[PDB]
Paper text:
Fifteen of them are accumulated in the receptor-binding domain (RBD) which is a primary target of neutralizing antibodies produced after infection or vaccination, including nine mutations located in the receptor-binding motif (RBM), an RBD subdomain that interacts directly with the host receptor ACE27. Here, we analyzed broadly neutralizing antibodies isolated from long-term hospitalized convalescent patients of early SARS-CoV-2 strains. From the structure analysis, we found that both antibodies differently recognize RBM close to each other to inhibit ACE2-binding.
NCV2SG53 also recognizes RBM at the class 2 site. Structure analysis of NCV2SG53 with Wuhan and Delta RBDs suggested that SHM created two interaction sites which presumably contributed to the extension of the binding interface and increased binding affinity to RBD. On the other hand, mutations other than E484 such as Delta which has L452R/T478K mutations maintained a binding interface with NCV2SG53 and did not weaken the neutralization activity of NCV2SG53. As a result, we identified four mAbs, NCV1SG17, NCV1SG23, NCV2SG48, and NCV2SG53, all of which neutralized D614G authentic SARS-CoV-2 at lower than 1 μg/ml of IC50 value. These four mAbs also neutralized Delta variant, notably NCV2SG48 and NCV2SG53 neutralized Delta virus at lower than 1 μg/ml indicating these mAbs are resistant to antigenic drift of the virus.
Author numbering:
A (entry chain R): 335 to 525
B (entry chain L): 1 to 213
C (entry chain H): 1 to 137, 143 to 223
Write the structure that this text describes.
């Protein structure tokens, strides 16, 4: 007996550049009758077959969770480009597993805007697959420095989300869950 | 935390001179500087941003100058409407700061005052208080003194005074010469006068009306 | 067509609270680092606070830190201020400015809305009384008079706006009665003394007293 259907059933995720991650082992899950609650706007696969794992065992099963905007849905894919895929959370080219999301505008779009969830609009370079630069450094867009102040070409790196409910779907808050794996060379833990 | 050396604080110019404003700065802000003109009470407006570039539709006479910490604003040929108070703004760090404010004038020839005289209105009188009012308009310079000669017994200490800002049109002022009295003290008298003494009034001249036309 | 609109000034008792509003359009609002400014009557202008493009970061000037509240609505193009536990010195004319565009990196000429008067006092509010001044004489001239309103402001306008030539708006000559009297008056071609009609356009909005008066002689 193992409790998988937990975090998406939970209420408030982390902002996308602050993506919460769970390592799961010593477990056993239902990958189908939870999928067959297929009210997820988006679901498609890059590692293994869709829901044919229910008798398959793993070393590591991973589940990062965050909230993006609706347009920002497209990004959570091996080989993607943009302030979400480059600066916030990169999926590798060798990605093993899949992703689910659903419209949380119902839940996580506060009337003045969920000014809580945020993303890193700005990084010097681009983060590696599975990287989380939760840095507040006042990004130097311009040559003259910031020293820790906001100002011209000296901007706060993380832009807020401001999920007003009226938004186009592009900006309704989609609650996202990734399923990586590092099943190799350890006990048979997750089936 | 970048403070601005608005230089100078006040000035006055003969019409169509070249004038120049320094704005030294407590930091090195690079070219992060805009220059604004504020007609009396209205909102400010940009005239130079990026410390050198002209705003759209502005005339060319305004010349943006500076880099580092010393900054200069040049006017080519000063104009009678350019009467304003002026502010440069630092734009580098978000503690957002200005210069103390260069109040700026026009030096026009001495104009002659224009003086009409008006009664208390019938609306005015019937309220319970009656007010007499004397006119100053389109004159230069603004310095002058007025006198209320009621019954020829002059009234000291019932006079409220406002002055217009210098005409942005043609650099000439105007002043409010209010009288304040109750209806009875308005009716006690019969002769009501108002006397004007300006520099360009080669001799002083006077307007008047008698309570009861 | 760059546009900004302050609205929400007037009287507020000190220790009570007020709220300002800056409606915008003409540019793309959600791009710009927004900010407010206030000027003590006649005195130097003072930046008071800002807000990020995304609302992700803001900060108040020290004279108001905490007591007031920046806020922007990205989808209705509006910046706000909530002003609380007010003070007789918080009294100023409160501008808003459009400054920093992440859509570029280059200098944006900041745009300032026309401003708005906040006056914090507990001596409460009085409608004005409007009084004409009928012309007498070589080329004539006439104007109006307003008296006994509180607080500022009241509005210059003439002949339903059709007049801006020679309109001499007077500063509000405050009274012993602790109120404001003042007037705007205009030089008037003595020839049009029959062919035209002249009406002046007050607006004391804080007392909601908004009235028009005829000026004709005798």
């Amino acid at each position: 007996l193992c409790p998988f259907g937990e975090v998406f059933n939970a209420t408030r995720f982390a902002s996308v550049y602050a993506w919460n991650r769970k390592r799961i082992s010593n477990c056993v899950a239902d990958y189908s009758v939870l999928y067959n609650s297929a009210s997820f706007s988006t679901f498609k696969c890059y590692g293994v077959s869709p829901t044919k794992l229910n008798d398959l065992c793993f070393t590591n099963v991973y589940a990062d969770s965050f909230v993006i905007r609706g347009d920002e849905v497209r990004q959570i894919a091996p080989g993607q480009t943009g302030k979400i895929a480059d600066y916030n959370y990169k999926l590798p080219d060798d990605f093993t597993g899949c992703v689910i999301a659903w419209n949380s505008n119902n839940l996580d779009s506060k009337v003045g805007g969920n000014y809580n969830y945020r993303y890193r609009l700005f990084r010097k370079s681009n983060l590696k697959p599975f990287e989380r630069d939760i840095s507040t450094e006042i990004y130097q867009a311009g040559s003259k420095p910031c020293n820790g102040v906001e100002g011209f070409n000296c901007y706060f790196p993380l832009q807020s989300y401001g999920f007003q409910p009226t938004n186009g779907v592009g900006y309704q808050p989609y609650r996202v869950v990734v399923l990586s794996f590092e099943l190799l060379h350890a006990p048979a833990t997750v089936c | 935390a970048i403070q601005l050396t608005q230089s100078p604080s006040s000035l006055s110019a003969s019409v169509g001179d070249r004038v120049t404003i320094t704005c030294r700065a407590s930091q090195g802000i690079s070219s992060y500087l805009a220059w604004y003109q504020q007609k009396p009470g209205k909102a400010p407006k940009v005239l130079i941003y990026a410390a050198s570039t002209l705003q759209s539709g502005v005339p060319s006479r305004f010349s943006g100058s500076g880099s580092g910490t010393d900054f200069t604003l040049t006017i080519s040929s000063l104009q009678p409407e350019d009467f304003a108070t002026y502010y440069c703004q630092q734009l580098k760090s978000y503690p957002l700061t200005f210069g103390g404010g260069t109040k700026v004038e026009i030096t026009r020839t001495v104009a002659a005052p224009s003086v009409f005289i008006f009664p208390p209105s019938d609306e005015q009188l019937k309220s319970g208080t009656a007010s007499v009012v004397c006119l100053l308009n389109n004159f230069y310079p603004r310095e002058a003194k007025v006198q209320w000669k009621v019954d020829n017994a002059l009234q000291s200490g019932n006079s409220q005074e406002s002055v217009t800002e210098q005409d942005s049109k043609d650099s000439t002022y105007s002043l409010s010469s209010t009288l304040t009295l109750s209806k009875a003290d308005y009716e006690k008298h019969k002769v009501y006068a108002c006397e004007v003494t300006h520099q360009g009034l080669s001799s002083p001249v006077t307007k008047s009306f008698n309570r009861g036309e | 067509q760059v546009q900004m609109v302050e609205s929400g000034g007037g009287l507020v008792r000190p220790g009570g609270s007020l709220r300002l509003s800056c409606a915008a359009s003409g540019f793309t609002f959600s791009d710009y680092y927004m900010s407010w400014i206030r000027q003590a009557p006649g005195k130097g202008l003072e930046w008071i606070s800002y807000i990020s493009s995304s609302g992700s970061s803001m900060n108040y000037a020290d004279s108001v830190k905490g007591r007031f509240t920046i806020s922007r609505d990205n989808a209705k193009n509006s910046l706000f201020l909530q002003m609380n536990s007010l003070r007789a010195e918080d009294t100023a004319v409160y501008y808003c400015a459009r400054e920093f565009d992440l859509t570029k990196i280059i200098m944006v000429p900041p745009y300032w809305g026309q401003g708005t008067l906040v006056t914090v006092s507990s001596a409460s509010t009085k409608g004005p009384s409007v009084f004409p001044l009928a012309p007498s004489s070589g080329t004539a001239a006439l104007g109006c008079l307003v008296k006994d309103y509180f607080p500022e402001p009241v509005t210059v306008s003439w002949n339903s706006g059709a007049l801006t030539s020679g309109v001499h708006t007077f500063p509000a000559v405050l009274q012993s009665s602790g109120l404001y009297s003042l007037s705007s008056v205009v030089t008037v071609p003595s020839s049009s003394l029959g062919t035209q009609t002249y009406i002046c356009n007050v607006n004391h909005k804080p007392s909601n007293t908004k009235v028009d008066k005829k000026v004709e002689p005798k």
